[model samples]
Target: TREEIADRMQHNPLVQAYQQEVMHWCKIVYGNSDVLKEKMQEVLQKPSEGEDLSRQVAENPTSVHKLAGRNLCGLKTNARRQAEEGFMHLCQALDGYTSAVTQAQENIKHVPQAEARRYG
Candidate 1:
């Protein structure tokens, strides 16, 4: 899982080689890169206009819903924390799945030919 995500991210032409270098570092230290990639994509995709409430607001100057509010000054601290935590979780998931695949491959590589013959 982690390896697959890393491969996908690495293969992305839009992401510079230096970015992959950073990802490699992350993999060595943190063991996952998907979370970081996803978080980055999220940041890239975020609207420049800030949060859009549209017509959902019923009254002027009403206290914005905690989840729906876009005032950076009001949400900056918590939003940053959420973004960081979310990225971390994504990284952890990618690392876990990728490690599982790596271990499985290692196990297969070490399998005895004699044991295989017995099974056959």
Candidate 2:
């Protein structure tokens, strides 16, 4: 059940990583919308080296919604690998959110269409 799984996830370490590492990065990336938009554009035109971006993110303290709002850039080969690790963790944690909801939807007990509308 999504309700059960979401509840249990409260103590999960992956959730911790998402909160501590990824969310921190998101905060740095998007603390200001204009800065974030500019940086993302600048990086897309000429990518920042991995170490530089890594240092930038590492230095900052910072959500999934902001993460999903745009495509990420500035991932040189090394940066790609470094970001890969954290992104992998991020993906897994996000999947839990998706899976919980998906399974719960599948588990739903269907009601007659007319009755469902009446409840709504």
Candidate 3:
């Protein structure tokens, strides 16, 4: 299924957005690792927040794996909202990839092969 998703990603725009944008943002968190972690630490230390899980974490539990390798900074309220927005878009991007590949496989199966190479 992942291979199928990868194959279609190159020829498919909807699928490509996942890697190009959503995943890139994922990488950016890693790039800013230490600083981001500091930010999260600050947030986590706030007993007033009353949850170890950030709002961003609560809103998108599925993102945990994507985030597991990265340094996370606890987000400010506004940033938390933005993070949730990105999290949702990433999920949508994933759906797009699945839809495009699944649809293409179904559609491609009905197609005849291209014209054979001309004989010498």
Candidate 4:
């Protein structure tokens, strides 16, 4: 059930539109997800390694994970936390959207093509 909820929300049009808005804004500001991921992952990985922040800037980079593990860092922390809370919100939200969509479909399914204009 939990997995299904996640699947549905990830596919929701509203959620997709919000993600696109993030990228659209970032494009104007010259913000790069890759760059932020590099900094952010280092912030996390160094701590997890029981090592200090001595991971020299232009020197040694991890042979492991590298470019891909970047988003993982964000996902493991704040993004995931927010997801849990938002997923709870979706519990009710999806219910409402489903209800509304169903009602809308019912209203239009067999109505005369000119029904809406006649009422107006």
Q: Give the residue spans of candidate 4 off by over 4 A.
A: 1-76, 110-115, 118-120
- For each candidate in the order shown, give its overall lDDT on alpha carbons: 0.35, 0.36, 0.39, 0.33
- Which tens-of-lDDT digit does each residue in 15-81 have in candidate 3? 3443354354443332222322332223223322323334443465544444423224854454445
Q: For model 2, how does the per-residue alpha-carbon lDDT over 11-112 read when each residue is reduced to its tens digit?
A: 334333433443444333343323233332232223323224434444442321233233348534543444444554434433333333333233332423
What RMSD value applies to candidate 2? 15.0
For residues 1-120, write the lDDT of model 4, one tens digit per residue.
333333333434543343344333222222232322333233222222212222321133232123221246445445444434443332233233333333333334455353344333
Top-scoring candidate (TM-score):
3
**Least accurate 10 contiguous residues by lDDT in model 4:** 49-58
**Model 1, C-alpha of 92: deviation from truth (Å):** 1.4
Candidate with more favorable, higher TM-score: 1 or 3 = 3
- Tell me the alpha-carbon RMSD of every candidate: 16.4, 15.0, 13.7, 17.7
* Tens digit per residue, CA lDDT, model 1, 12-85: 33333434443543443333433244433332233121112211111221232232113466554554455344
Q: Pick the candidate with the highest lDDT.
A: 3
Let me know the TM-score candidate 3 reaches against the reference structure. 0.41
Error of 2 at 101 (Å): 11
Clashes per model (N, Cα, C within 3 A)? 4, 2, 3, 0
Clashing pairs in 2: 23-62, 24-62
The alpha-carbon lDDT assigned to residue 75 of candidate 1 equals 56
